[PDB]
Amino acid sequence: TEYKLVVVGACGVGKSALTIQLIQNHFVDEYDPTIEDSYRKQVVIDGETSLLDILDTAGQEEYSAMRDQYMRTGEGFLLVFAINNTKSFEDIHHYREQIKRVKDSEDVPMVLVGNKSDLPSRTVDTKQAQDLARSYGIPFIETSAKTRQGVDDAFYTLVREIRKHK
Amino acid sequence: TEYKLVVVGACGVGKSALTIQLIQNHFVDEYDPTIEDSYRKQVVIDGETSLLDILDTAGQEEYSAMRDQYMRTGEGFLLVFAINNTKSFEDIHHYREQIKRVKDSEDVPMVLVGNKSDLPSRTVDTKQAQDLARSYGIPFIETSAKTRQGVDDAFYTLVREIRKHKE
Numbered sequence: 001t002e003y004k005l006v007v008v009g010a011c012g013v014g015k016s017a018l019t020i021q022l023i024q025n026h027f028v029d030e031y032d033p034t035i036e037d038s039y040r041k042q043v044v045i046d047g048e049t050s051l052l053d054i055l056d057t058a059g060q061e062e063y064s065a066m067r068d069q070y071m072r073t074g075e076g077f078l079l080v081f082a083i084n085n086t087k088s089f090e091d092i093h094h095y096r097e098q099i100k101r102v103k104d105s106e107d108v109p110m111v112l113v114g115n116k117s118d119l120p121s122r123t124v125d126t127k128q129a130q131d132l133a134r135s136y137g138i139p140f141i142e143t144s145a146k147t148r149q150g151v152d153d154a155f156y157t158l159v160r161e162i163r164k165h166k
Numbered sequence: 167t168e169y170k171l172v173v174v175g176a177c178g179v180g181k182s183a184l185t186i187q188l189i190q191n192h193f194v195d196e197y198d199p200t201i202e203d204s205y206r207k208q209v210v211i212d213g214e215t216s217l218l219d220i221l222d223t224a225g226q227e228e229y230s231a232m233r234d235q236y237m238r239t240g241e242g243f244l245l246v247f248a249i250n251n252t253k254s255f256e257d258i259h260h261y262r263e264q265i266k267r268v269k270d271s272e273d274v275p276m277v278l279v280g281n282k283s284d285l286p287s288r289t290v291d292t293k294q295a296q297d298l299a300r301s302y303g304i305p306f307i308e309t310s311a312k313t314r315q316g317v318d319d320a321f322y323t324l325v326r327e328i329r330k331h332k333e
């Protein structure tokens with residue numbers, strides 16, 4: 001059983017750092033922001049094995065038919081913001097709207113991810129994120145790509161959501 | 167000719183005040199933020215008469231398939247920001263991208279409108295908006311719905327843009 005996971009979020013929230021931690025078990029500082037690539041990983045979650053095809057999104061603020069079609073192939077999405085970046089949290093609503101748009105307003109598997117939780121420079125309250133995740137009906141996971149806090153949990157939780165949805 | 171004009175922009179930038187000034191020649195200190203309505207007006211621009219149907223957009227930050235097809239009926243778009251609201255200027259990119267998406271075109275008739283020019287507490291430099299409009303290939307008009315400065319010119323300029331695009 002193979003699932004296409006897509007990691008989305010504003011520039012600089014930690015999409016690549018989170019993915020590379022998951023796949024390669026190290027923290028990359030300031031990874032090339034133009035590289036969009038897909039990673040493969042076999043996992044066991046709740047005793048059951050799944051193969052993940054994980055798209056680490058990168059590119060410009062723009063839309064197109066082919067990008068719509070490509071994102072439509074995603075089966076679950078990590079909505080990543082950074083806890084020290086209010087704009088990236090406000091953007092989450094836009095990411096969800098565009099994902100639902102291209103997937104016919106399906107109840108798409110999604111996990112809200114609050115990254116950079118190691119930092120003391122918080123601007124988004126945990127309560128705000130929990131309330132937002134509650135409104136959307138999705139889990140919220142606090143992560144740090146730097147310390148690896150929550151990294152496996154974020155991706156594993158998204159797989160749990162895909163399984164529930166299937 | 168009959169042209170559908172659509173007024174877009176962030177909450178509070180003056181979309182309704184601009185439209186009501188154009189149509190009814192007065193300034194509203196406050197107007198219900200949920201009312202989205204269309205207004206008609208016959209005008210003569212550059213010696214030629216046109217019938218304008220002006221959609222004053224209001225509502226929530228959400229997409230719907232019917233919303234896409236409604237916006238698709240627009241033939242030209244006013245991108246309104248407020249010159250004392252940096253965030254409303256930063257949002258202009260998003261509005262333009264959504265218009266291009268539903269029109270499936272990069273050459274949609276548009277005018278960039280910097281409203282509330284009467285205020286002294288500017289936070290968006292005029293050159294920054296001029297440079298943005300240049301990169302978009304569209305006109306930039308400074309307006310005040312309060313004093314009526316630029317109001318006719320914003321809508322008339324959009325009609326000129328539509329005319330240039332249809333021919």
Ligand SMILES: *[C@@H](CN)C(=O)N1CCN(c2ncnc3c(F)c(-c4c(C)ccc5[nH]ncc45)c(Cl)cc23)CC1
Pocket residue numbers: 008009010011012057058059060061062063064067068071094095098099102
């Ligand atoms: C930093 C400036 N470079 C910045 O904030 N962003 C934000 C958006 N970014 C982004 N990169 C790659 N891919 C996408 C993307 F596919 C979409 C998207 C979605 C989620 C659904 C449907 C879409 N149709 N076209 C694009 C679509 C979005 Cl919203 C943003 C993407 C990084 C740059």
Ligand SMILES: *[C@H](CN)C(=O)N1CCN(c2ncnc3c(F)c(-c4c(C)ccc5[nH]ncc45)c(Cl)cc23)CC1
Pocket residue numbers: 174175176177223224225226227228229230233234237260261264265268
């Ligand atoms: C208020 C709270 N901060 C606020 O800023 N907004 C943002 C703008 N909003 C809005 N209201 C009504 N209609 C739209 C709208 F049609 C679109 C839009 C555009 C510009 C192009 C294509 C579209 N397809 N579906 C919707 C489309 C946008 Cl982007 C915003 C709209 C709500 C309140």
Ligand SMILES: Nc1nc2c(ncn2[C@@H]2O[C@H](COP(=O)(O)OP(=O)(O)O)[C@@H](O)[C@H]2O)c(=O)[nH]1
Pocket residue numbers: 009010011012013014015016017018028029030031032033115116117118119143144145146147
């Ligand atoms: N302190 C801290 N920095 C992070 C974290 N995740 C990513 N970064 C850093 O934030 C910046 C942006 O990360 P990046 O992975 O490139 O974000 P992306 O643009 O969403 O792919 C980099 O300098 C990263 O080193 C984190 O969890 N904690």
Ligand SMILES: Nc1nc2c(ncn2[C@@H]2O[C@H](COP(=O)(O)OP(=O)(O)O)[C@@H](O)[C@H]2O)c(=O)[nH]1
Pocket residue numbers: 175176177178179180181182183184194195196197199281282283284285309310311312313
């Ligand atoms: N000083 C000043 N205030 C304006 C102007 N245009 C709109 N407003 C005010 O800004 C607020 C929002 O106007 P409104 O038309 O309701 O914004 P909308 O949400 O974009 O439709 C109102 O209090 C208006 O009176 C302007 O040109 N100058």
Ligand SMILES: [Ca+2]
Pocket residue numbers: 015016031032033034035057058
């Ligand atoms: Ca990246």
Ligand SMILES: [Ca+2]
Pocket residue numbers: 136137138
């Ligand atoms: Ca749910």
Ligand SMILES: [Ca+2]
Pocket residue numbers: 168169170241
């Ligand atoms: Ca027409």
Ligand SMILES: [Ca+2]
Pocket residue numbers: 181182197198199200201223224
């Ligand atoms: Ca209004």
Ligand SMILES: [Ca+2]
Pocket residue numbers: 228229
């Ligand atoms: Ca909806």
Ligand SMILES: [Ca+2]
Pocket residue numbers: 302303304
């Ligand atoms: Ca042009």
